[PDB]
Paper text:
To explore the substrate recognition and transport mechanism of LAT1–4F2hc complex, we determined the cryo-EM structures of the complex bound to various substrates: L-Tyr, L-Trp, L-Leu, and L-DOPA, at resolutions of 3.20 Å, 3.58 Å, 3.10 Å, and 3.56 Å, respectively. In contrast, the HAT + Leu complex exhibits a fully occluded conformation, with Phe252 completely covering the Leu substrate. In the Leu-bound complex, the carboxyl oxygen atoms of Leu are hydrogen bonded with the backbone amine groups of Gly65, Ser66, and Gly67, and the carbonyl group of Ser338 in TM8, whereas the α-amino group is stabilized by the backbone carbonyl group of Thr62, Ile63, and Gly255. Notably, the hydrophobic side chain of Leu is engaged by the hydrophobic side chain of Phe252. A structural comparison reveals that Leu is positioned closer to the unwound region of TM1 compared with other substrates, potentially contributing to the occluded conformation. Leu interacts primarily with unwound regions of TM1 and TM6 via hydrogen bonds to Ile63, Gly65, Ser66, Gly67, and Gly255, stabilizing its position in the binding pocket. A further hydrogen bond between Ser338 and Leu’s carboxyl group enhances binding affinity. LAT1 bound to Leu adopts a fully occluded conformation, whereas LAT1 bound to Tyr and Diiodo-L-Tyrosine represent intermediate states, transitioning from outward-facing occluded to outward-open conformations. While the residues involved in Leu coordination are conserved between the two transporters, those coordinating Trp differ.
Numbering used by the authors:
A (entry chain B): 44 to 507
B (entry chain A): 162 to 631
Write the structure that this text describes.
């Protein structure tokens, strides 16, 4: 009663694009410009983020080819280091990191979808929250209904967002070719905080956030046809296209709007559409909303698969990782992800906090590469269809420590808080995994709850 | 592993009640989703809408700069006008949206025949340099306004008896300079011109017919409100500057009455706020009131107009020998080698360029706030009563960040002594608001201060800011 083997190369490429393209391209430019000022500095920062993401994606493709198990970035650490680090990562993964990206993307989609109705006066927040909740509910419903439908939706929305970006690039090129210049030729005029590495890493945080989701295909592996050939091919097809699209869009943005008006603005896409169209200027917010819809739909699938694979190792209750007959879908995992995502609606502005815990997020990746090189060194027996030349993982980890050292040199108390949060998973781990021969009254209670959920949702244990 | 197997579930969960419960739960979920969508639609429709976009012109955005004479502005070697391109960075720092340029047409004192409105004076430069200046200004996004006073050298600016010939020549120069590429026109001493109202109406009609983004500036020395209103009978899109607001030197309530009466008579139209037509700020005010007037002019609902050198508080009485009409600009400590005298940083451009408590920094901050804020751009005006010598008003457009300005014209300290008396309920002032700046250093920034017991120092200005509320 295995799940399926249905994801093809095109489906994986579409999933990557949809996930990688969500709302960062339409929001993070303002923050990265305020934190860099010089358009050339912003462009080179985005290029550095792109090449770093390409490096990481290649290394993760190598690792996934080596270990053909579902739920990447977590199965590898479990294989290499043991049980404690894996559960320590997963405990905060299922609380903070995962049920925050979906909510933020849904909120951005809701805000941008209602922009034409309220062009000047800001939209009410309650309506945006309701629209985001409706979007999340509909997406989790369609994901639970089937797998092929989710893939078709992902491909359709990826095509839509690619067409939108192509139209933006064409408009920018037409504006450039009309015979008008800007501060692009005399760039680097201001170049502030050139020696201040704090602002540099602050801008790099937003740049890396805009590049997030590049490793989500490793979560859904063991479910795609012929992974050994399809995975690296999909990654190398997808990543450079994303980098090129991002840099071209950033270049096309500056040719229309001045630096001061970009910094003072709040919706650069809306201003670009208004300037270049005047009438029928509502297309851009609609396309942004569609892109965000596709991104959150892509993220939910990977989150559900990650929660599915983790529960098979006993780190999660046995009610999870419990497949459904007839249609093969992990209903409890999707329901849990949806209910956890909705729980963040009872919060104030969260974007300022999204940079929190990024240090640990990029730290776990570094340990994964260390585990990969450890396995490559001390275990020269596993069959490796793909082999990557050295000093590429070395450069990746060196960049990781360079990025992690600044987070300790500056804002240290804001790291110690949060670091205390990640360490708070020790008591729950010792209560739920290490502990054995617990008092029986809990045992039949959890058994009865699991049986009740079993009967209510009519699912089957993972027999095979 | 911790629950029923496949066969056990198949045997147990086969009762019709269970499938009925599942069907009911699915239906309940779908109707709940539909109800949530309906509630979202209801909350969308029952909400106030955005007000409007006034679609203001280019000159509604920022202040205007009156260069006037060129020799005094750039000191020695200022004959060539192309040298003003090296000063454009200073204007960009001042972020002014316009530039009133002095008369350049040929004029030999009162010789009407020897007065061409198309001939550029050789000492000023040539046509090619003028075109280069226009191109550089367009690249820097600064418009150019050129003055066409028929007699900028003689005592009578309108050539005395000659009225028809000068009218025809300036009428031709209208189209000539409009096709040359100018962005607006300015005339002065209209009060010394016979039946000039028809002339201004015709010139405004021609300028508007040529293009929609053009301007026409008029200047008179009449401070009579009735005379100004009469001059605006046949024209409503004309910017007129006069000495109406100047020559008062009295309490703040007098200025409040003057401004309120002008707004009431005009009808809340667009106006120009300037002390005079060609005079400096220091020509009518003491050194202790320059900052207060600078703060007041940048917040009134209109287009502020300043003369050259008044952003640094230049004074003509000091450094004697400089004519009051065209005092020399004090760029740096060596900007006036011809006349030795007082040299210090308090009165030099580069000297005040780094001082945070200098006039130039306050001018730059006020210009940025005026040019970047929607409420200061095209907001509303509402003035309420205050203490004996206090001027207070608020600005608010639709829903953006509101602004509150309080000025103390008195020379003694006093409490706020203010009441709400606010007509717009949506603009009602709360008890908490932030502070932006004050003319007298010694106060903090960004602290939410109670709007009830404000203590005002002599000659003090405030910039209270509070967010939109219900
Ligand atoms: C001024 O221009 C307008 C439009 O080209 C014309 O007159 C306007 O419309 C009526 C009809 O003549 C007048 O009563 C208005 O006063 C004019 N509008 C203005 C002056 O703003 C006509 O071509 C021109 N008229 C004159 C007297 O110059
Ligand atoms: C502008 O200043 C001049 C200079 O005093 C004054 O103009 C006077 O106008 C009256 C009639 O309008 C005439 O007697 C003379 O033209 C001027 N009187 C003089 C020179 O004694 C007046 O102060 C101002 N002009 C105005 C307000 O129209
Ligand atoms: C000038 O006087 C008042 C000052 O505002 C103008 O407005 C009048 O006063 C009340 C109370 O402030 C306003 O609410 C009304 O708009 C006006 N009341 C009337 C006209 O009865 C007034 O319009 C002006 N008087 C004029 C132009 O003759
Ligand atoms: C800078 O500002 C003015 C000129 O820009 C000057 O003010 C002097 O202040 C001293 C003491 O406060 C007094 O003697 C007079 O008020 C001014 N003296 C002179 C000679 O102008 C002065 O140059 C500077 N102000 C200072 C130092 O406070
Ligand atoms: C981490 C991901 C949710 C970010 C995604 N690429 C977006 O910009 O929407």
């Amino acid at each position: 009663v295995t799940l399926q083997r249905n994801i093809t190369l095109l489906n994986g490429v579409a999933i990557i694009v949809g996930t990688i393209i969500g709302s960062g391209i339409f929001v993070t430019p303002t923050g990265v410009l305020k934190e860099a000022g010089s358009p050339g500095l912003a462009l080179v920062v985005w290029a550095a983020c792109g090449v770093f993401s390409i490096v990481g994606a290649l290394c993760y493709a190598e690792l996934g080819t080596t270990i053909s198990k579902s739920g990447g970035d977590y199965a590898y650490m479990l294989e290499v280091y043991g049980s404690l680090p894996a559960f320590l990562k997963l405990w905060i993964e299922l609380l903070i990191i995962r049920p925050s990206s979906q909510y933020i993307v849904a909120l951005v989609f809701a805000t941008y979808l209602l922009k034409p109705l309220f062009p000047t006066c800001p939209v009410p927040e309650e309506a945006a929250k309701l629209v985001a909740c409706l979007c999340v509910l509909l997406l989790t419903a369609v994901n639970c209904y089937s797998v092929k439908a989710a893939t078709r939706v992902q491909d359709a929305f990826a095509a839509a967002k690619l067409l939108a970006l192509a139209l933006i690039i064409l408009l920018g090129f037409v504006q450039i070719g009309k015979g008008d210049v800007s501060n692009l030729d005399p760039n680097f005029s201001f170049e502030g905080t050139k020696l201040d590495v704090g602002n540099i890493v602050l801008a790099l945080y937003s740049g890396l956030f805009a590049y997030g989701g590049w490793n989500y295909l490793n979560f859904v592996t063991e479910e795609m046809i012929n992974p050994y050939r399809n995975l690296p091919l999909a990654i190398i097809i997808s990543l450079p296209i994303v980098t090129l699209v991002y840099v071209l869009t950033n270049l096309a943005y500056f040719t229309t709007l001045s630096t001061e008006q970009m910094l003072s603005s709040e919706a650069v896409a809306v201003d670009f559409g208004n300037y270049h169209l005047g009438v029928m200027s509502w297309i851009i917010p609609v396309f942004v909303g569609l892109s965000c819809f596709g991104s959150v739909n892509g993220s939910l699938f990977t989150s559900s698969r990650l929660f599915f694979v983790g529960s098979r190792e006993g780190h999660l209750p046995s009610i999870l990782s419990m497949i459904h007959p007839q249609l093969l879908t992990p209903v409890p995992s999707l329901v849990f992800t949806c209910v956890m995502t909705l729980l963040y609606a009872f919060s104030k502005d969260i974007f300022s906090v999204i940079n929190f815990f990024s240090f640990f997020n990029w730290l776990c990746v570094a340990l994964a590469i260390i585990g990969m090189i450890w396995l490559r060194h001390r275990k020269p027996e596993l069959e490796r269809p793909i082999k990557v030349n050295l000093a590429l993982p070395v450069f990746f980890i060196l960049a990781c420590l360079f990025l992690i050292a600044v987070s300790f040199w500056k804002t240290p108390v804001e790291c110690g808080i949060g670091f205390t949060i990640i360490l708070s998973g020790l008591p729950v781990y010792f209560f739920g995994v290490w502990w054995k021969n617990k008092p029986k009254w809990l045992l039949q209670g959890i058994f009865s709850t699991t049986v009740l959920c079993q009967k209510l949702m009519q699912v089957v244990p993972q027999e095979t | 592993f911790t629950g029923l197997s496949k066969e056990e579930l198949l045997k147990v969960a086969g009762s019709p009640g269970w499938v009925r419960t599942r069907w009911a739960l699915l239906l309940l979920f779908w109707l709940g989703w539909l109800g949530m969508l309906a509630g979202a639609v209801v909350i969308i429709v029952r909400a106030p809408r955005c007000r409007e976009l006034p679609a203001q012109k280019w000159w509604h955005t920022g202040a205007l700069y009156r260069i006037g004479d060129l020799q005094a502005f750039q000191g020695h070697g200022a004959g060539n006008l192309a040298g003003l391109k090296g000063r454009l960075d200073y204007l960009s720092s001042l972020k002014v949206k316009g530039l009133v340029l002095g008369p350049i047409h040929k004029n030999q004192k009162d010789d009407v025949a020897q007065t061409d409105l198309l001939q550029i004076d050789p000492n000023f430069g040539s046509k090619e340099d003028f075109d280069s200046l226009l191109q550089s200004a367009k690249k820097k996004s600064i418009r150019v306004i050129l003055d066409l006073t028929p007699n900028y050298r003689g005592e009578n600016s309108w050539f005395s008896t000659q009225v028809d010939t000068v009218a025809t020549k300036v009428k031709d120069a209208l189209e000539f300079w409009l096709q040359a590429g100018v962005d607006g026109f300015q005339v002065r001493d209209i009060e010394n011109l016979k039946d000039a109202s028809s002339f201004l109406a015709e010139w405004q009609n021609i300028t508007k017919g040529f293009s929609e983004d053009r301007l026409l500036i008029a200047g008179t020395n009449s401070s009579d409100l009735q005379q100004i209103l009469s001059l605006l009978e046949s024209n409503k899109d004309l910017l007129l500057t006069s000495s109406y607001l100047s020559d008062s030197g009295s309490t703040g309530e007098h200025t409040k009455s003057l401004v309120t009466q002008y707004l009431n008579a005009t009808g809340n139209r667009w106006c120009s706020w300037s002390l005079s037509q060609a005079r400096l700020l220091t020509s009518f005010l003491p050194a202790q009131l320059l900052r207060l007037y600078q703060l007041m002019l940048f917040t009134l609902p209109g287009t502020p107009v300043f003369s050259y050198g008044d952003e640094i508080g230049l004074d003509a009485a000091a450094l004697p020998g400089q004519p009051m009409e065209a005092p020399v600009m004090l760029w740096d400590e060596s900007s006036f080698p011809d006349i030795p005298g007082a040299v210090s940083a308090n009165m030099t451009v580069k000297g005040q360029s780094e001082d945070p408590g200098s006039l130039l920094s306050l001018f730059r901050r006020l210009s940025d706030q005026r040019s970047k804020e929607r409420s200061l751009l095209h907001g509303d005006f509402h003035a309420f009563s205050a203490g004996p010598g206090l001027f207070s008003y608020i600005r608010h457009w639709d829903q953006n960040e509101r602004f509150l300005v309080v000025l103390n014209f008195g020379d003694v300290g006093l409490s706020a002594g203010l009441q709400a008396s606010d007509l717009p309920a949506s603009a009602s002032l709360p008890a908490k608001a932030d502070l932006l700046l004050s003319t007298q250093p010694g106060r903090e920034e960004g602290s939410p201060l109670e709007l009830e017991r404000l203590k005002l120092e002599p000659h003090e200005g405030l910039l209270l800011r509070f967010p939109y509320a219900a």
